[PDB]
Design a protein around this ligand. Sequence first.
Ligand SMILES: *CC(=O)NCC1CCN(C(=O)C2(Nc3ccc(Cl)cc3)CC(C)(C)OC(C)(C)C2)CC1
Ligand SMILES: *CC(=O)NCC1CCN(C(=O)C2(Nc3ccc(Cl)cc3)CC(C)(C)OC(C)(C)C2)CC1
Ligand SMILES: [Mg+2]
Ligand SMILES: [Mg+2]
Ligand SMILES: [Mg+2]
Ligand SMILES: [Mg+2]
Ligand SMILES: [Mg+2]
Ligand SMILES: [Mg+2]
Lengths: 236, 236, 5, 5
Amino acid sequence: GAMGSMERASLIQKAKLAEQAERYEDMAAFMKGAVEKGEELSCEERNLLSVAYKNVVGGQRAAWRVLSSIEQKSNEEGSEEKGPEVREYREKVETELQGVCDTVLGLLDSHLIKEAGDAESRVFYLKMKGDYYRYLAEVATGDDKKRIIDSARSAYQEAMDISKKEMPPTNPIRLGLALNFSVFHYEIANSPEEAISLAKTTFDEAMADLHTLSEDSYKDSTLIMQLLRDNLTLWT
Amino acid sequence: GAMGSMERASLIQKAKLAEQAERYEDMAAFMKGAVEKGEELSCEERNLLSVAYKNVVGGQRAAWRVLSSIEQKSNEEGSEEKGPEVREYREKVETELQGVCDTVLGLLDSHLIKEAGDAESRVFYLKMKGDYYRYLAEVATGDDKKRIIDSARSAYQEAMDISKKEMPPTNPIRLGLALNFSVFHYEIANSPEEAISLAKTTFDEAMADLHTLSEDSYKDSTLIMQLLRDNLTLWT
Amino acid sequence: FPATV
Amino acid sequence: FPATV
Ligand SMILES: *CC(=O)NCC1CCN(C(=O)C2(Nc3ccc(Cl)cc3)CC(C)(C)OC(C)(C)C2)CC1
Ligand SMILES: *CC(=O)NCC1CCN(C(=O)C2(Nc3ccc(Cl)cc3)CC(C)(C)OC(C)(C)C2)CC1
Ligand SMILES: [Mg+2]
Ligand SMILES: [Mg+2]
Ligand SMILES: [Mg+2]
Ligand SMILES: [Mg+2]
Ligand SMILES: [Mg+2]
Ligand SMILES: [Mg+2]
């Protein structure tokens, strides 16, 4: 680890600076270094980790989609053969994406998940595990595709089970998990009815619990609820 | 060169794909590989080179400015000491920026400039040389600062001399050079009157030559002229 | 694409 | 910042 010589606190400070500077690759490396110190992460620190890698892989996913579209077009009838370059470069970006996913999954497996005992931390990491297996599923075309999908599903399902037992229906992590698992159903598992059902039930149960919240918690919860509504609007 | 094994044409194809995918670091690496094949660059290829590195260094400059601002604030009276991390991370980004500038300058020196005989190519590369020494000047605080500034100035001045002799006042490269050299005067050389004079004279001489142009050339020229106007509005 | 967080 | 190209 290139970050092995840097203090945990300095890695966290620098991750924050990197976020301010919109340097998400640096942010992700700092946060990897912090995780590898071996201590559990606070809430703020888990958020830094997630934001960093979400931004890095988000950029790779967007790039992969642009390239995959160009590649598809090149493989339609009446398209002029332009050699292996589009496939090669889509593969390059794909491999880099896969590497990032593998890195995040490796952090989760060694050893964030196993040390996470509180519902809020355990659900957050299991949601991440689901997300990064979903990103691997997005680009999978091989022998392992079904197993990758199932890995995403299993991680999301464990998170869902804990969240429903341990968190209120308005809890932002419970909402965010549901939002993402619902997307997994729609986009990855070919289960749009499950996606819709989950988004709707999650929204409605949250609605009914808003009355219990402070103004600030209300703001947090309603923000993610609107994302559930946005997807339902997209899908219905 | 990691790109040594890839065909020139494939590097150019991939640079275009990288641009579409907004992967400017990859775009810059592909274009470096193309340059290092040792053949001169066409207009389109020079544009790819410039766009790639402009985007990479643009991002580094923005990040450097964010970090430099935070560092300045930390060095004001009544600011709480937060250790070496802000300086260290500004230095990290600075060193990476400098590396990119050095790489581009190295391409120009080995051997793009010396093989560029036509006004349009020679002026374009000399403008780049000015730009990348200007970016080095932006972060310079040392013994070499004056020499770095002078290197930018000299490159811009050689480009200016060729452009005024060889190109019409509406030529987009002549305009873009002037725009940038005018910025150099304002921001780097502490010569705002020179900056203003250059922007104004360049704009006015271009205005008077618009009548000679096709609709498409008119569009090209007026676009950059508006940038000259925008800066003059900023400065007056 | 749909929203995720 | 001023415009450059
Ligand atoms: C430690 C902890 O409890 N973290 C949960 C926070 C993360 C930030 N929150 C959000 O609402 C946003 N992100 C997010 C990320 C993961 C999950 Cl599971 C839920 C929510 C952050 C902001 C508000 C900036 O925007 C989005 C839309 C990304 C939601 C609050 C709970
Ligand atoms: C080979 C050659 O002649 N290149 C000059 C072109 C580059 C693209 N042009 C532009 O007007 C823009 N970029 C630019 C870059 C360098 C210089 Cl010296 C001048 C201009 C490209 C577009 C139109 C996309 O936007 C900006 C505003 C960046 C100008 C035309 C001349
Ligand atoms: Mg320590
Ligand atoms: Mg592959
Ligand atoms: Mg159910
Ligand atoms: Mg060859
Ligand atoms: Mg330095
Ligand atoms: Mg003059």
